[model samples]
Target chain A: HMRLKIAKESLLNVLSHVVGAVERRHTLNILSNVKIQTNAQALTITGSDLEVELVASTALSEGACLEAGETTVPARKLMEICKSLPTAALIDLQITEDQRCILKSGNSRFVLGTLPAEDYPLLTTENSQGTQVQVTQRELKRLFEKTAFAMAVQDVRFYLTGTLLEIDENQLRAVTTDGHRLALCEILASSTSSQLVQAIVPRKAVGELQRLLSIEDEQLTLLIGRELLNVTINTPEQGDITVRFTTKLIDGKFPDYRRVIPRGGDKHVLIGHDVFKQSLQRVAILSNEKLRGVFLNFNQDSLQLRANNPEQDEAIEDLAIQYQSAPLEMSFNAQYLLDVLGVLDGDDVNMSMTEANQSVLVQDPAHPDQTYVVMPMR
Target chain B: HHMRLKIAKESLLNVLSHVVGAVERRHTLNILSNVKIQTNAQALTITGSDLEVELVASTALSEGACLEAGETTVPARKLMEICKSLPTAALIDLQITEDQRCILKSGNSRFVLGTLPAEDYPLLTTENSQGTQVQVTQRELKRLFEKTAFAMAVQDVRFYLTGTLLEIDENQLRAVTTDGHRLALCEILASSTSSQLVQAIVPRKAVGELQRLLSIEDEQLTLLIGRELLNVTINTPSRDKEQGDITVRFTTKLIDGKFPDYRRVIPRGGDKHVLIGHDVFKQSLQRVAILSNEKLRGVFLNFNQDSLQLRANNPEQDEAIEDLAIQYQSAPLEMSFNAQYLLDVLGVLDGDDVNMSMTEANQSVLVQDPAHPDQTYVVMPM
Candidate 1:
């Protein structure tokens, strides 16, 4: 057991964000307690909702430091006490090596039972063949921002559910999807190794990593071995906290996504991307609840969209634009189009298509440099 | 058009949290600006979604400087922009011009847009001879807050089915499911109602804000019928902005599509409904789901009544099963359902035990509280 003196407000605010999604009551007693540890240097706290494990450590440097200790305390009870305590009061904790800890805040005192340190599984860290990549925390945050939503949750294929991190010579790419859609983002990186290293980090760790990566400007070190993925993010206001996780890389094979993307689509259409997309979103109002299907008919320089649900109630919107694409028709899930449009930065986007049945490739018309392929529904 | 200066940031934030769920960007045209001027001495403006099909407005008041006059238009685009750009800043005008146009000015950048007068707008304000009504606990908010919010259809086969149905009695507030898949909420009303007959369709969107509106000491509110709509307005300090006529209501517009005969689909002649420890069942299901196929999500439930077993297998020939003691007297029965659906319902539910009954394979299964029957769920077989 270890002892420490820290501000209840800061500790509670940080831990509350991580554990807000955790179940109030869990069968596994260990799952409910936030694992707290203090060594010679700093204090470490970790919480997991099974799929997503969040570990955050703050130094008691600015406040007051006492004897070093470690134990798993009931996270909920501790949080409740801390949250309710007077903001200005300093919280003091005294624990013994036998795993007993007492918390005192001003006049209020709470004695919470603790689980043995051995029972609290220490996160596995395997030192194996690895590549250490350095990148700005802000850039990594941006990559997560673009692709985190597409990560599949608890999917059987497993690998498809996690973010695929590919480390190249000068850049890093993160891609994720649940089969219905895909989101990919790239960030500049500094790495000397020329070897291409790729790893799939489960959806859980990705979420926690994103949360940890939000602190500005600080640099993050990514270490990848066979099954272990470790992230060390140093907090600016707080001290350095290391979050290490290991999830078995799903052995099952993933589909050839590159082959799935459409390559050649000739006729081009350029419209008021906002108005065109918003029109699709509006027409999709009545599309079938389950299918959310929207029909796009191209004529001369104008695009007409029609959508309706089972209720015969239909919404139709027309957008005039710069297009000479031969008269073609296609159908797609309105949500997919809406998603692409929302994330895309530019105002005008070019949708290149060969025919109605084939997939359409959309790109920022102004750039004409980057490309995204979206397959039309059959 | 008519015109005035108010803070868009404060007003939009108050309403955005309520309407985010049901506002159809594609069907933005359907959303009606619920602007009513209620001036005793000071004037207050309000807005609401299109729940007119199921409810109506009330103008029974005999007093006040009530200019029963107003207009409607697309307030979402401007509302969304103002919310994102100036989250906390208090800026400029909130007005309705005589030309049926609306405008907002913040610094040099001004947004001028079109509007539809209140006359052209269809507000569902229906009245009834009389019906039983009640006030529910702010705690009752937890029932819907806990699980049902996720189950409401973004859009579904049954247009009316998209909204949750609120049935109230002297003792309880029942929030029935909107999806054919198993889902629902029920709680003891905060207090009792005067009448015995009370029911209303709470549009999917309205239920999102229902909890916030009910955050009052009484944990209750007055409910009435306006035209074709069912209105529920909470009288509380927290009620958004000016609580005047903050009536949350909507009407059920029957769907032309055929609603599957949910009753017939519900397993009849079921061996019996079984009660099992909710935790054990959920854990076993979670583990077994690891082996089920991605598409099928099919899991088999075996009940000998005294003991319940869950079984599932994947194409990899992987199989998982678990058994637990339960309360049942009927013979063994077997049925299959999409594992995800079962997980969704079970995961959201509270209580120590869950009761489920089925007649046979391919037949729908009925899940309900052993304590209550009005809040029943019938899930079709996979």
Candidate 2:
């Protein structure tokens, strides 16, 4: 029999990190069980749904680990049991290949059904000389948030279901476009690769990565290989729990974004970032709920934002902008404009337009590296 | 062709706060979706109704200035939303036109909302009678109903069991609810304004809304119980610089059917007396319940002289056992019960310890809090 004795709090904390990868409805029953294992050095729990896998490990301090072995139990159930138990209680977990896994604390005992740990599929990637990037966790989080919403939500091109990260020496650029709208952002980075490395992270991984980065801002390394991307986040809050989140990178090429970023638009409009977002939101209330289209009539008479449904209920708002150009009557989905404005960082956003029917380039006046383009609605 | 009424954005929203909940999100009749705005006699009354329940709130306005005594109906939730988004203390002017428009202007924005004749709004009115009345603190009435409301049948063909039964006996008001397998009853002492007795099964929606309508503190609240109508009138305390108390009257129709006899449902005497630490017992039962049959949720409790043994197993052959110290000495009895029913009781049940009085293996057990004897819970054996 393989066994371990540990505090309920530590065990519960580690289980939560890995459990996010375990779906309630599994392709196979064993996929619902997290693989719990211990070695001479530490205790590690791994949960995977094939495409994405998360493994959390903590050092075996003093009496925490009793034996060096591994077993499998239902992920959610194990976590819940640890949650339901007393905080300071030392839960004694016992496992055997032929017998049911049993957990005991005080006078209580739970005989949980267990499957062979050998049957649990592990996602292992071949070691490669991948590009290693050192980026502040906060910066990486910003990149994901600004681009994650732009990915197709089957979702974000079954390759735009993800954000594209093009990494080079001292730089990391993220680009995502759903063919309808495009978002691009780049940040200074320290990298080990000489060549340009592009890794497309699926939307699923982007969400989990965002959650992990929010734990605390520290310099973390990202290993971007031709086929895989892995991030390891360490938290000393729970006896220095370390979580390695791994996801398979999409094996396709992204459309060359340089050809799509509109350039040299003669007409330009600049407005307070937050003020424009709020005014657009107010007019959005009466916009056609289905189309969510709002008209932007930009002439020497400032900018007029107006929307009305078939019910003839109209909302009109005029915002003062630094623009005097040939009149352009353009319309767009309010969702794209608000999403881009929410992510843009600055006092003002300068929108450059070529024509009323063509794409309008949107970017913060301070940071031109972070650029956005929104298309007009018919 | 119209009258001009100016109300501060904050003022109308504070009054609209009391009126929006009674309006259903979607209504069968279009007029039911609009709130009746009637301003006259130095007052502006806002009424929102869904035919089943109605909430009418009144705010006092200036007497002789700018008031033309207008009445019209506009979309309830839309008006409230607009009021909330406007800046604080921004003066809002309502220009009621002779045509189909009610132009509402605030700051630089204007909303021309459609309106229906105030006369077309369906009002909830009960037959005039000398209805019974009871007075209890807002907190007291809320606690009395909330403690027992969770046990009501969620979706039942029996229909009457879907609401909680409120029975007024002399100075005591009792609320009882049951879902066939379990029963919950709670009581509070109230002062009756009339000599007549009142018993009505209030629907689930009405009970839920009433819980939200009344505040958590002790405001001396009055409940008027008519034959077909149940009304609770709450007066919002006037602000230091504001008009009179915003009188909010919440009224609903009582359920037409009678609930099960809750008195008989409560177990009277059970010789097996078992007392266990409230939190300890609750924790032990939760662990044991993890292995209980998913659908049946059955768990067995074996009682001996000084400890209670809880055992549970599922169809998957997984088993869980927990032994906790308890004060029990009746000739070693074993009873099976649905785990959630016991937890439900323990959740609402408050005390240092909980007592369970059981008679036999198949009989129901009376669960109670030794500290507050006003609440009682009965769980039937599985």
Candidate 3:
């Protein structure tokens, strides 16, 4: 009945990666347990909800398995036990004949309640084959980080809660919007498919991918199928870990985002990104808490930022900027503009608008591949 | 039209941080969310109160400030937020116009806050009798509160238990707290003697504020105790310079009910005494507690064969067993207690080893810190 003697760090690593897919709501009885299986050569642990599945495994050599076995144990409790063990401690996880997982490290022992491995739900797709795309971890991680913030957290339009990933000739694009503001970023990658491919990646999967892409500049494989997306990344921390994440993609179609992009903006302002970002932070402190609105009055050499509240209180900020157009004034949700500035990495940010009520086009002047549009406030 | 006053934004923020503790986030009296600000030739007084407790601090205007006397109340949180948002050391020019709207201007930035008339702000004023007086070192007073403050009932129907019992006897200042399941008592010696035995139950909120405002240094601090109120005063707040003098006074209403007598509850004699490494015992208990019953949190301790074994099991059949070597040698003894109770004592105790005295399986346990003989803790078996 004895199974494996694994290093505490490696066992903890395997559990941490897979545990994200385990939903905390106890309403689903069988979804909380992690299924651990041991073959002759390796031990694998898998955690899944009905929508997403994460599998992480490490080889038994550094040959630590005594016998091949499989069982399901409470995922969070197992991780806590491993984490509490002393560093570099050898951890023993044995499936006993009585159907309990007996875990031991040094002088401490734990008997974790287990559910039958056969009862645990595993995500299975009818069609397993998909078009595979190879992309650097850094490239894909950047694509999501720049655009994920615009995704709607709670919306009636289910499609708006996920990022739209579009593959064109030699470019990969990620765009997201909550209907009030839109963020779009694209990068040129050599491995792009000759034909077009588009996938609406769910918000949760986008977050999980960001966490898994720890090794920057390394290769991460993505398998995009009919309604599923699979990602695999190899982490060579203390021990080697192969993490495979499979998530069900949203089937709804994303709206056309091109209409929001501003093409007729003639008046523009160029300012230091850090200064522009910091000014809004101070000015927004007094903004109406509900609307978070701030008024921006732009002139040839300066920008006047102001906020007013219902209490007859006002906060005003004066920022020096370089502009050469007729004076313009626009009101915007300070948080939306802050979010756009947060992702634009250039030293200077360029914001162009034709009038006070139109959407403002914002981009990093040094690197113009990404475009952000924030709706103006009255 | 009212006169304008200029003061460093940093100085205003410093004063705001000390007084805002008494203001609740939401209030039945909207004016309770504002602090009463009154200025005189000597200093500016900022007071915040929630009816039960009041914290007031006074500071002389800094060098860069130009001032005329003023009095009014402004929203505490919004004023502080605006002051913090302004550039550091920038002078804020403020005025309460005839219309009673408070305006603050610093650099090119301006903020206007709604003000309530100074007469409308509710003030908790204690009558002017110095009451029973006692003084102790700031360090000793802070220690007296810290060592036992955690054991106070977070919330309870027993009103007295929700506050800390402060007793000033012949030569020692003692603080005792308990929730019936366990008790903590910490005593410190003081030079001055109040009327032999003066006891007051300082509410939990006041205890936290004192813990926040207290200085760990050995400077003498004074407290004026009354049956209805408790007042503390200190001249300098983390400073000693001539112009840097700040006077802070903390006052709170006393809990009216009688606190349970803690002395009668401490066990005097227990035959079995055990010596266990503090970390070894604490870490083992922490590990075993992970599988303990979610609600009861009971962990079983079995001392046998010169070793102490800790075990816990949940309703789900999950079990955790931990063993630690100890100097306990007698017939085996088994006892059950809320794991959280033991961890709390363990966390506050300071020493290399934990000393415990047990009389029987069902009797309460006395856990002591040999290095600090002034501290005593009793944990009742579950």
Structure candidate 3, residue pairs in collision: A60-A63
Candidate 1 vs 2: which has more TM-score: 2
Candidate 2 residue-pair clash tally: 6
In model 2, pairs of residues that clash are A151-A156, A152-A155, A152-A156, A153-A156, A156-A160, A156-A161
Q: DockQ of candidates 1 onward, in order? A: 0.03, 0.60, 0.75
Tens-digit lDDT track of model 3 for B266-365: 9887788998899888888888988998888899999886798999999989999988999887778999999899999998898998899989998999
Candidate that scores best on DockQ = 3
Tens digits of per-residue lDDT, candidate 2, B1-382, equal: 3556887877777778888888888898988888888887588889988887888998787654245677888878777876776666778888788876677777666666777888888888777677888888998889977789778889888877888888888798889898898999999989886556578888888888788777788989878887788988887776846656788889998888866677787888778898999988989999999888888889999999999999999887988899999998888999999998998888897699999998989899999999999999998987
lDDT of 3 by residue, A1-378 (tens): 558888998788889989998887756777898889987787799988867788998777746888787889898888888888888999888897788899989999999877888788755556687666777888888999899999999899999999998877777789999999999988765444577777898888888888888647887667877788888888646568898888888998888888778889999888899888878887898888999999999988999999988876788888888887899888999999999988988999888899988899998988877899988987
**TM-score: which candidate is best?**
3
Clash number by candidate, in order: 37, 6, 1
Q: What is the C-alpha local distance difference test score of each model?
A: 0.61, 0.84, 0.85
What DockQ score does model 3 reach against the true complex? 0.75
The docking category that best describes candidate 3 is: medium
Residue ranges of candidate 3 with Cα displaced over 4 Å: A26-28, A124-127, B1-3, B128-130, B237-243
lDDT of 3 at B329: 78
